[PDB]
Amino acid sequence: GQELPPGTYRVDIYLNNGYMATRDVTFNTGDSEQGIVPCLTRAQLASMGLNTASVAGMNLLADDACVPLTTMVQDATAHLDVGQQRLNLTIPQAFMSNRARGYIPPELWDPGINA
């Protein structure tokens, strides 16, 4: 048991040990080891390459709505390396694609980009 959301942080975002993006990230009490989960949406997840149309649920949410990762999808995960300032995400091939029935870049979701 741990918890420490300071209310947004800026990190290098990482998925399946590949790099993704370098943007601000909001993360808050939910359900993980630190309690805290990142806010990630069907837009943003599909930039990384999550098949929002595979998970029989996210395709019924909004284009930018907060969507879980360890929950919506099976065996995907999200962790904060607060030692190294890095967002560690995991997603199996069973739910990976870019096609989001929507999709929005990080310039149009802008959570607190040095703001």
User: For the chain, what is the domain count?
Assistant: 1
The CATH number assigned to the domain holding 91 equals: 3.10.20.410
Experimental method: NMR
Q: How far apart are CA 72 and CA 115, in angstroms?
A: 30
Q: How far apart are CA 85 and CA 100, in angstroms?
A: 28
Q: What angle do CA 81, 82, 87 make, to 5 degrees?
A: 40
Q: How far apart are CA 70 and CA 9, in angstroms?
A: 21
Q: How far apart are CA 5 and CA 26, in angstroms?
A: 9
Residue 23 is assigned to a structural domain of this protein:
yes
User: Could you list the residue range(s) of the whole structural domain that residue 59 is in?
Assistant: 8-97
Q: How far apart are CA 96 and CA 76, in angstroms?
A: 10
- φ and ψ of 60, to 5 deg: -115, 0
Residue 107 is assigned to a structural domain of this protein:
no
Could you tell me which of 79, 66, 72 has the C-alpha nearest to residue 111?
A: 66
CB contact at 8 A, 38 and 48 = no
